[PDB]
Design a protein around this ligand. Structure first.
Ligand SMILES: O=c1ccn([C@H]2C[C@H](O)[C@@H](COP(=O)(O)NP(=O)(O)OP(=O)(O)O)O2)c(=O)[nH]1
Ligand SMILES: O=c1ccn([C@H]2C[C@H](O)[C@@H](COP(=O)(O)NP(=O)(O)OP(=O)(O)O)O2)c(=O)[nH]1
Ligand SMILES: O=c1ccn([C@H]2C[C@H](O)[C@@H](COP(=O)(O)NP(=O)(O)OP(=O)(O)O)O2)c(=O)[nH]1
Ligand SMILES: [Mg+2]
Ligand SMILES: [Mg+2]
Ligand SMILES: [Mg+2]
Lengths: 164, 145, 140
């Protein structure tokens, strides 16, 4: 069984993420996630919050996942790419999901709160069975402190904490 | 057993996809796919058709797959990237594969029909055993809506 | 069990890859690898050598793996992307790992030998148990 757990962590996320269980009858690989706020992306790098904490679990164990562009993210009107190509979300991450979006155009670009620019894909590309939208308040076991915690964007250092 | 199935759906695709079964003796992860038409890529975003329907099957089940750039897609002469980083193809998708390619340069670039800019990779990165090039003029149930 | 094997093939790599066994207690998906040389990345495409040969094994069999940017590779100061999005390394490949990096900015940019810009990820995204740093030119 492959399940995603999404918890809204702002008032804005609560508009798009009511407490519910979503099934994946279509068997799509990706879980679309909302901007939740109207965005203005400047030419160059933009750091964008997704207003959610996410956990993935496969065969009953907490696992990693990937952030991938939707094919609709990039249009003639909006030349947007994920800076990191895909987002590699480590099993131990329990912070807010963030995006690095490059606007390749010369003009600032507007995104609606209701748009999904990206999709979450389980470690190993397993088709999700259920998407669990958790209550904003609750404590969830899978968000418990880890060695990584909310460490992201070079939190591990230049050498990679991995090191060698 | 991981198998790919490619059906050409245009006469342009029939030039590059003769009916056959390709084995993957080298155990490469990626299945190279042809442009099938010469194209000029304008600076900015370009929509490129791949002229094929594809199915992947793993352990007897229809699965998804991914479209990745070949390391040779991007040269000094042609600063090309996949707009979406990786193409994510759902198990239920039975239409023509399409690419969104960005030309990051100031100047239009020529691609040739016989070039492969991208490669297909099974859901979960399983090494393909066979690539079945299907006859153009059939309705295969694997491609049913 | 999922293990990486890194074999330095230059003296520059030897200086950053002393023989050793790294356990992945954090259970991170990616193995960070050094640039091993100071480099200046020009606007447009830059070919960057990683000074290493790498093997990945899963359940005692040699497998492929992938090269991805670290989320920290791209910043306001260094607008850097992997040209191919992710590098796909076939299980059959035994040569040096190479990068194609695009500087999207108008200005050259400095990268440092002790910097890791990219990470390796096993075929199938398996969490690595061990990273084995081998001796220079030591076979798998
Ligand atoms: O697109 C992303 C990518 C990563 N992340 C988070 C989760 C991930 O576990 C954490 C670390 O990502 P990387 O390991 O891929 N980047 P880096 O190695 O530079 O950061 P760190 O040193 O903290 O591991 O950053 C995002 O929120 N969005
Ligand atoms: O690079 C690609 C990506 C997707 N596709 C096809 C197959 C895929 O299952 C389908 C939808 O892909 P995305 O989820 O990335 N696009 P989006 O979410 O914007 O549209 P849709 O609502 O149809 O999923 O489009 C391509 O042909 N090439
Ligand atoms: O980023 C990369 C990508 C690939 N490689 C290596 C490993 C891989 O097995 C080999 C082939 O890569 P691609 O299949 O993506 N490039 P291409 O298909 O253009 O060349 P080839 O015909 O040699 O496979 O080059 C790298 O060193 N770095
Ligand atoms: Mg979609
Ligand atoms: Mg190849
Ligand atoms: Mg990291």
């Amino acid at each position: 069984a492959t399940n995603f757990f999404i918890q809204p962590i702002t008032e804005e996320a609560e508009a798009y993420y009511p407490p519910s269980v979503i099934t994946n009858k279509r068997k799509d690989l990706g879980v679309d996630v909302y901007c939740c706020s109207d965005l203005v992306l400047q030419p160059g790098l933009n750091i964008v919050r997704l207003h959610i904490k996410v956990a993935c679990e496969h065969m009953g164990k907490k696992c990693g996942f990937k952030i991938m562009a939707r094919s609709s993210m990039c249009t003639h009107e909006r030349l947007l790419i994920l800076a990191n190509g895909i987002g590699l979300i480590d099993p131990g991450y329990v912070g807010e999901l963030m995006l690095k979006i490059i606007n390749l155009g010369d003009t600032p670009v507007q995104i609606w709160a209701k748009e999904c620019l990206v999709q979450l894909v389980a470690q190993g590309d397993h088709v999700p069975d259920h998407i669990n939208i958790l209550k904003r308040n609750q404590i969830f076991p899978l968000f418990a402190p880890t060695p990584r915690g909310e460490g992201r964007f070079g939190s591990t250092g230049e050498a990679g904490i991995m090191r060698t």
